[PDB]
């Protein structure tokens, strides 16, 4: 009634927030998953990195999980907060 049915995508806000919460919960409490975020912490906190740091970070992330899993390159740019996500599933192997 308020939005003239333009707010229909907000009908499941509780369920989507619950699913996000569940995904965060299994994000810290899974083996071969939390150390990837720890590596992200080390990469983000330690700035002024060259390219070779980026490739060794890539294979160090790869070595944590299985050889058949999928990698995702979620690029962030401070200027413009533009998150480009790239599909490199079984590409760097």
């Amino acid at each position: 009634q308020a939005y003239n049915n333009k707010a229909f995508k907000l009908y499941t806000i509780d369920k989507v927030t619950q699913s996000l919460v569940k995904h965060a919960h299994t994000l810290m409490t899974d083996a071969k998953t939390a150390e990837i975020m720890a590596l992200f912490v080390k990469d983000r906190n330690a700035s002024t990195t060259s390219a070779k740091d980026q490739i060794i970070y890539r294979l160090q992330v790869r070595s944590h999980m299985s050889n058949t899993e999928n990698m995702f390159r979620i690029e962030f740019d401070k200027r413009t907060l533009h998150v480009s996500i790239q599909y490199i599933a079984l590409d760097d192997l």
Binding site: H23, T33, N70, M71
Partner: peptide, 25 residues
């Protein structure tokens, strides 16, 4: 080839962090 004061930051992730970030977006 040192990139000082970097602005583009890369997150490498499996399906779990990707799906979590997709739900956030």
């Amino acid at each position: 080839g040192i990139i000082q004061n970097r602005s583009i930051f890369n997150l490498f992730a499996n399906t779990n962090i990707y799906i979590f970030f997709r739900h956030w977006t």
